[PDB]
Structure formats: C-alpha cells, structure tokens
Design a protein around this ligand. Structure first.
Ligand SMILES: OC[C@H]1O[C@H](O[C@H]2[C@@H](O)[C@H](O)[C@@H](CO)O[C@@H]2O)[C@@H](O)[C@@H](O)[C@@H]1O
Ligand SMILES: OC[C@H]1O[C@H](O[C@H]2[C@@H](O)[C@H](O)[C@@H](CO)O[C@@H]2O)[C@@H](O)[C@@H](O)[C@@H]1O
Lengths: 226, 232
C-alpha cells in the first residue's frame, strides 16, 4: 500500500500485530519494553523491542517517490534509582531486524558493539554527558544531532516525529504535561540509509542501572508522495 | 490498534503486506486472483485469495465497542468465453482462514462443499438459486453459512472496471454495498448484521475468486480500507 496508518490509544493484552522481541511484553494496558518483576519494578540487564507487523513502503525508486510519515507516542520511565537507565527509542529499520547480539545497556537493543534511523531518549551518562539527551541516529552514526532533555520519573512524555520528503527534514517535538518542550530536527535522505520497505517500532534497554520503559500509546501514518 | 487504514491505488509486483493463497498473484500492476496463462488469458479450475497481513480488530467485548469500517475496491472480469465464471468476493474471516478443500467453482474459494461475512459478485448460473434470478449475475451478501441473505441483480461487462464501496456502521449495524461502472450505472444492496454474532474479535480482510468449468479473470485493480473501534 502507498498509504498506511494505525492507532494504539492503549495496548491491551490481546495483541495481534506487534512483533515482540527480547523482554518486551504487554502489562497494565501498556507495552513494557524492559523486564519488570512481580511487583512491576524494573530489573537490571534487560532489552526489549516491538515492531508493527505490517511493513511500511518508505520510498519507491521506480516512481521516484518518498513517504511523508508521522509517529506520535507517549512513554514514561520509572525507577527506584536516581540514575535510571538506559533509554527508549523509536526506530525504523529493515523488516527482518532483530536485537543485535550484545546490544544491551547503552546500545539500547539497537546497535551491535546497519540500516536504521532512530530517535532515542537517553537518561544515562555529541552531547553533554552530565545530563539526558534526545538523539537522532542514522545508520551507524549515533547522535548525528542531539538536544538536552530532562528525565522526570513517572511522567509521560508526548512525542511527535515527522518526516517531510520535500525538505527531507526529520522533526522531533516532545513535551511534558506542564508544557515543557524539547525539539530537534535533522535533514536526512531516507533513500540513502534505508531500503524501500521497512518496519517501525520501539526499543529500550537497561544495563546495571534500570528503569521501566513503558510505551503508553502510539499512532502512525505514512503516505508515498511525488 | 483500535484503528487501521491502508490504500493500494495499484498493486506493483513488490508486495509485502498481502497474504497470497491458491493461484493468486501480481501481474500487470494488479492482483490476478485466478490463474492466467502467459498471454493474460484466464484458465479453468483455478482458485485464489489474498488477505491483508495485519489483523483487524472488528469488535471488543470488554469495552463494548464495535468497529466502523469501509472497504473500497475495483476489479474487472475478462473472458474469451460468452459465460465467464464464477465470481469474485470481498470477505472478512478468522485470521487463520485458508482455502477450504473443494471450494472451487461456484463456491468461490470461500465455502466448503463457517465464520464469515462476504459480498460476492457472481456471474455463474445456478439453477438452484433461491434468493436471486439464476439466469443473470448477482451481487450477494453472505453471513456465516447463509449465502446471499440478500441480493440484487447485476450486469457483467467484460473488461470493464466496477468500483465498489462496502461500509459498516456499528450504530445501525447496516452493511451497505454500492457498486458502479464508469458510466455511472449503479447497484446497491444493504443488510443489517451484528458482526459480533458471526465473527471473532480479530479478523483478516481480503478477496477470493474461482473458476470451475467456465472461466474468466478476476483482476483486483485497487483497494483501500479503514477501520476504527467505536463505543456502542
Ligand atoms: O553486563 C552487564 C551489562 O553490561 C552492559 O551495560 C553497561 C552499559 O552499557 C550501561 O549503560 C550501564 C547502565 O545501565 O550498565 C553497564 O555499565 C550491557 O551489555 C548490558 O546489556 C548488560 O546488562
Ligand atoms: O473440475 C471442474 C470444476 O468443477 C467445479 O466447478 C463446477 C461449478 O462449481 C462451476 O460453477 C461451473 C462453472 O465454472 O463449473 C463446474 O460445473 C469446481 O469443483 C471447480 O473447482 C472445478 O475446476
């Protein structure tokens, strides 16, 4: 299809179109990307991701078309620690993507110690190591562009990621319920790093430091344009 | 997802989200549900179907919600014969649905000699028709094991594309079918149906077609679909 869209106001346990990888699973009508014990508390050394089952036609060489897409989602991070880690990321990658061997901890279950575009929200220590940051990743280049961010335990962060094929601008806008806002954008020709068909989803991980990475909602739309 | 939408203005050969069953396959930027030879001509004894890969959440008991959906598509039938057969159908069924053994010919690859809702466009002659004039093609609505719970006379036009819009409103439970040729000739058939009484919560949507002794192409040219859960 030239156009595809789907919306998850919440994530009930009765899932059918999500490819769960690692420790990712549904709990409390939300996707708990990283493992949690019987009390719902985050544990160390855990990685998990999800991908929507239907593939997205990101661009088409024959028709010289590239897709305009938007991804809106909400998540919250909680931890008994004061330095919860490591982070959650929205990513786009080849359809058969799997958690790379040894990509736990700071590699967020996305990179091995390949083809992909990701927007990561890192809370652990191209950016000020002293504080959290939002980063845009392109292929093997992590944080080609970043912006300072603030972690707020248990507070949902609403995010909107948009891609305009005409300008090739990948825009990211994130806000907390009080209006605090973060934004970062970067020019990227999706045709130079990703195949025509891809899958979209989220990934998260925790090494020695931990926190829950709870994806609360997610909506997405994509349409090929001339 | 409570909502899902997708659109195929055409069907290029590099498909990823379609589940091809039987002889169904992509040829000339369209889905050829039934088999065709090297010259584009239809052959006898063939059945084929397609389903969109992502499952559709039709209803949810826990929230007392039912989906409002619409399916728009166009197809064309072509045959060197004077009586092409048998027909093409849009259908909704359990996710693991497969072609029933012996469902060729007049069974369209949908019924065995179950749980489903379908809108079939038949061109075959069945001297046992009890809800439509057998001497002429018909469009019929199928609910579970009841084929053609309601029908309307239709005309077969070789090689001409028929545009169809199928809509379901959970508030009224009306399943509306409107089909038109490029000249505006219109066919309408509608029926009340509580999808909750015939289909599971999650389903797959798609098309099916078959040719027995008589044959014709069943070319699906375009297809768009949208569904959203609503309280109720
Ligand atoms: O082997 C334990 C642990 O090692 C690695 O995690 C490290 C680092 O990547 C993380 O940022 C921090 C904070 O969580 O913890 C470690 O220092 C990863 O290989 C991880 O998968 C693993 O659990
Ligand atoms: O083996 C021949 C053919 O038989 C059956 O088709 C019959 C009937 O269902 C069709 O409506 C008419 C016209 O196409 O042809 C036969 O009479 C099916 O079993 C079919 O699969 C098979 O090829």
């Amino acid at each position: 299809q030239d156009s595809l869209s789907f919306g998850f106001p919440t994530f009930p346990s009765d899932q059918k179109n999500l490819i769960f990888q690692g420790d990712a699973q549904i709990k409390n009508n939300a996707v708990q990307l990283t493992k949690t014990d019987s009390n719902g508390n985050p544990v160390a050394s855990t990685v998990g991701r999800i991908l929507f089952s239907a593939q997205v036609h990101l661009w088409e060489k024959s028709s010289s078309r590239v897709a305009n897409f938007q991804s809106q989602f909400s998540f919250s991070l909680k931890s008994p620690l004061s330095n919860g880690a490591d982070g959650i990321a929205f990513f786009i990658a080849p359809p058969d993507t799997t958690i790379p061997s040894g990509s736990g901890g700071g590699l967020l279950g996305l990179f091995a110690p390949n083809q992909v575009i990701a927007v990561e929200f890192d809370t652990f220590y191209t950016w000020d190591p002293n504080y959290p940051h939002i980063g845009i990743d392109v292929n093997s280049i992590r944080s080609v562009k970043t912006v300072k961010w603030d972690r707020r335990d248990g507070q949902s962060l609403n995010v909107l990621v948009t891609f305009n094929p005409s300008t090739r601008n990948l825009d990211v806008v994130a806000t907390y319920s009080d209006g605090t806002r973060y934004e970062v954008s970067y020019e990227v020709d999706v045709r130079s790093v990703l195949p025509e068909w891809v899958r979209v989803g989220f990934s998260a991980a925790s090494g020695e430091q931990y926190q829950t990475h709870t994806l609360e909602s997610w909506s997405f739309t994509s349409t090929l344009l001339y």
